[PDB]
Amino acid sequence: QYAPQTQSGRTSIVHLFEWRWVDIALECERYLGPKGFGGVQVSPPNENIVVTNPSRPWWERYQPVSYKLCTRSGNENEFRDMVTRCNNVGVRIYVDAVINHMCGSGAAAGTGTTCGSYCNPGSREFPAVPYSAWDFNDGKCKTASGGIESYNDPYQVRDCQLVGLLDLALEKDYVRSMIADYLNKLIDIGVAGFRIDASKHMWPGDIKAVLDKLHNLNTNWFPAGSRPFIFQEVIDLGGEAIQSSEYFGNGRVTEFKYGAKLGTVVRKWSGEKMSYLKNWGEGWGFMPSDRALVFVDNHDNQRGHGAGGASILTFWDARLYKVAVGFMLAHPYGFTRVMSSYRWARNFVNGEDVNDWIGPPNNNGVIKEVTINADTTCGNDWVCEHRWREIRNMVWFRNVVDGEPFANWWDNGSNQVAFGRGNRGFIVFNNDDWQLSSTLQTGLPGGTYCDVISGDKVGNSCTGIKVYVSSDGTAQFSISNSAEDPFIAIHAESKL
Ligand SMILES: C[C@H]1O[C@H](O[C@H]2[C@H](O)[C@@H](O)[C@H](O)O[C@@H]2CO)[C@H](O)[C@@H](O)[C@@H]1N[C@H]1C=C(CO)[C@@H](O[C@H]2O[C@H](CO)[C@@H](O[C@H]3O[C@H](C)[C@@H](N[C@H]4C=C(CO)[C@@H](O)[C@H](O)[C@H]4O)[C@H](O)[C@H]3O)[C@H](O)[C@H]2O)[C@H](O)[C@H]1O
Ligand SMILES: OC[C@H]1O[C@@H](O)[C@H](O)[C@@H](O)[C@@H]1O
Ligand SMILES: [Ca+2]
Ligand SMILES: [Cl-]
């Protein structure tokens, strides 16, 4: 459950948030495959309720009504086609499994669903599954409102309603089996693993019981006996009743402290400095590297939802975002996930974005295609961070230095920092308000390397900064505090 099951040499996955199956299929063949991306985390592929107020928000996909592969991203044919085409080019697919609940208990009975399935939230009727009143935790929840009134009580958070969502009685074998059948169908289709949504709201044992029923991965692409990759969404910033460690037996867990702390350090808040990152990782109180799935921001916290707060860096703060993603992709800690978002009209009234609900780029409800521009960027308001040179080249960097140990750390005692990875890569950062000009030990063999942050190595030339490393591994790095990208990165494969 801990092994990502990516094709050898590939070390990251991209969250193609709200993308349509057809666009992902294309993206796999034209970009993800050739650019060494390990895989893609897709949005919930099962049927959800249609929320008309507000107009088709992104969160309606987290309110299931059945397990039919039928959504705004596409139908089952399109889904199967995507998985096949992506696996065929070496890019795995990971599904966002929403299994702790069904739709909002307050939703209206009817066929206002993405596939037309009938459902009656009021009576807990979900005919298309099927689920009935006795498959929910209403009777087990002890709070007056039936909702989570305190996060200090493990029972409320797991047995009661998360924001009014109907809570599934996961201790029942019937429910356990319905969910397993859904996941098994996906596994057989070719999916490599899952993101267990809202794991914190389920007992580790219930998740385990479900996982034990899962099929081995499809042998058309995976070796016989391969277990699916599992990463559970557990928001634990420390100091709360439920600990992420309670889920280590099921698979990897989302380390939310990673993005919260990094954002604060890179922004230079609360007295934090980049020089403090020397012992980044478990030294900062994070979970063991091999149990962690790390990221800078995720679909929730980039828009105020979930956890992280104001410190979280997103594509909105492009410059700082790039250095944080670069640091993450360079550091050996955890399995990295890269975010890929869409632009929305933010509108902050009282420090709160009242438009945080806005769904993906659409034409009267139907999702717009991802258009690719000549300069390799995306149109139709898809930001495509994964296509930014600075990001795509760091994904490559991670592949290249995979397995090499953290080494040759250097810092100016403030915000200028540097470290390498064995003898295959080195990265330098300047987040101070002054010039960086030093001769540092890179640990790399002598030669001329193309900086992959400012450019690329084309044939036998660099399109950006070139770094000459002496026979003794040293090199000079000159980075101005006003540089567009205040960091340089070089590796074995960018060598001329
Ligand atoms: C979003 C994450 O919430 C929780 O994290 C909390 C941490 O546990 C806690 O430590 C931290 O301090 O605070 C966090 C919350 O800010 C979960 O632990 C975490 O798993 C969540 N992230 C996951 C999980 C979900 C749920 O599947 C997704 O949440 C989004 O989607 C829901 C559903 O669409 C959305 O809620 C909308 O719908 C419900 C029904 C509305 N609730 C109203 C309706 C009724 C009647 O049914 C009333 O009873 C309710 O009281 C009333 O509020 C919501 O108003 C509406 O927004 C969430 O807002 C979305 O965030 C996440 O996407 C997923 O990543
Ligand atoms: O050593 C790790 C610690 O270093 C301190 O200087 C920082 O302020 C802490 O946030 C961090 O956890
Ligand atoms: Ca629950
Ligand atoms: Cl997540």
Swiss-Prot record:
Catalytic activity: Endohydrolysis of (1->4)-alpha-D-glucosidic linkages in polysaccharides containing three or more (1->4)-alpha-linked D-glucose units
Glycan attachment positions: 412
Location of this chain's protein in the cell: Secreted, Extracellular space
Cofactor binding note of this UniProt entry: Binds 1 Ca(2+) ion per subunit.
Disulfide bond positions: 28-86, 70-115, 141-160, 378-384, 450-462
Biological processes annotated in GO: carbohydrate catabolic process; carbohydrate metabolic process
Catalytic residues in the record: 197 (nucleophile), 233 (proton donor)
UniProt xrefs under InterPro entries: A-amylase/branching_C (IPR006048), A-amylase_C (IPR031319), Alpha_amylase (IPR006046), Glyco_hydro_13_cat_dom (IPR006047), Glyco_hydro_b (IPR013780), Glycoside_hydrolase_SF (IPR017853)
GO cellular component: extracellular space
Marked site (Transition state stabilizer) residue numbers: 300
UniProt GO MF annotations: alpha-amylase activity; calcium ion binding; chloride ion binding
Principal EC category: hydrolase
E.C. number(s) listed in UniProt: 3.2.1.1
Domain of life: Eukaryota
Further information: The two forms of this enzyme, I and II, show very similar activities, molecular masses, and compositions and differ only in their isoelectric points. As no evidence for two variants were in the cDNA library of PubMed:10082956, it is most likely that isoform I (PPAI) and isoform II (PPAII) are two forms of the same protein.
Family: Belongs to the glycosyl hydrolase 13 family.
Protein name per its UniProtKB record: Pancreatic alpha-amylase
Species annotation: Sus scrofa
